[PDB]
């Protein structure tokens, strides 16, 4: 599926081919950016504090739990996606990985089934 690796500051370090397809950003364009470019407001402006709160309390809200959220593509379109966050260490500093599963089709079929009674 789509995978993203960021450093302890939310800056994208690695961006898989499938993440490019899904988000609309090539790997080169993404790598120097904050991960928040992939999400809409209010999460966007709050993501850095989500990361900071975790590094300070060590209390996970998504790590080891998973969560369905709304992500944002480059063209502006938003979409539902499941997210799993993993924690890793490299060169003494923390890095996090995000495995993403696009749930757009699921949301569509569900919504479609409901509108037909
Ligand atoms: C792109 C759509 C994304 C959205 C909407 C999103 C949203 C959120 C939200 C809502 C929180 C926790 C807020 C709370 O419950 O306290 C959070 C935590 C965090 N996110 Fe994301 N996130 C996104 C993607 C990512 C990705 C791709 C990564 C890593 C590659 C990531 C790294 C983190 C980390 C490290 C935390 C804190 C972990 C924790 O609280 O357990 N996020 N994110």
Swiss-Prot record:
Identification of the protein by name: Sensor protein FixL
Domain of life per record: Bacteria
Positions of the PAS domain: 1-55
Residues annotated to bind heme: 47
Part of the full-length chain shown: 154 to 270 of 505
Organism: Bradyrhizobium diazoefficiens (strain JCM 10833 / BCRC 13528 / IAM 13628 / NBRC 14792 / USDA 110)
Chain ranges of the PAC domain: 56-115
Function noted in UniProt: Putative oxygen sensor; modulates the activity of FixJ, a transcriptional activator of nitrogen fixation fixK gene. FixL probably acts as a kinase that phosphorylates FixJ.
């Amino acid at each position: 599926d789509a995978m993203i690796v960021i450093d302890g500051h939310g800056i994208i370090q690695l961006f898989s081919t499938a993440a490019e397809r899904l988000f609309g950003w090539s790997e080169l364009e993404a790598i120097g950016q904050n991960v928040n470019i992939l999400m809409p407001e209010p999460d966007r402006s709050r993501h850095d504090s989500y990361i900071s709160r975790y590094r300070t309390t060590s209390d996970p809200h998504i790590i080891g739990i998973g969560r369905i959220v709304t992500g944002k593509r480059r063209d502006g379109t938003t979409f539902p996606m499941h997210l799993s966050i993993g924690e890793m260490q490299s060169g003494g500093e923390p890095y996090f990985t995000g495995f993403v599963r696009d749930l757009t089709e699921h949301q569509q079929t569900q919504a479609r089934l409901q509108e037909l009674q």
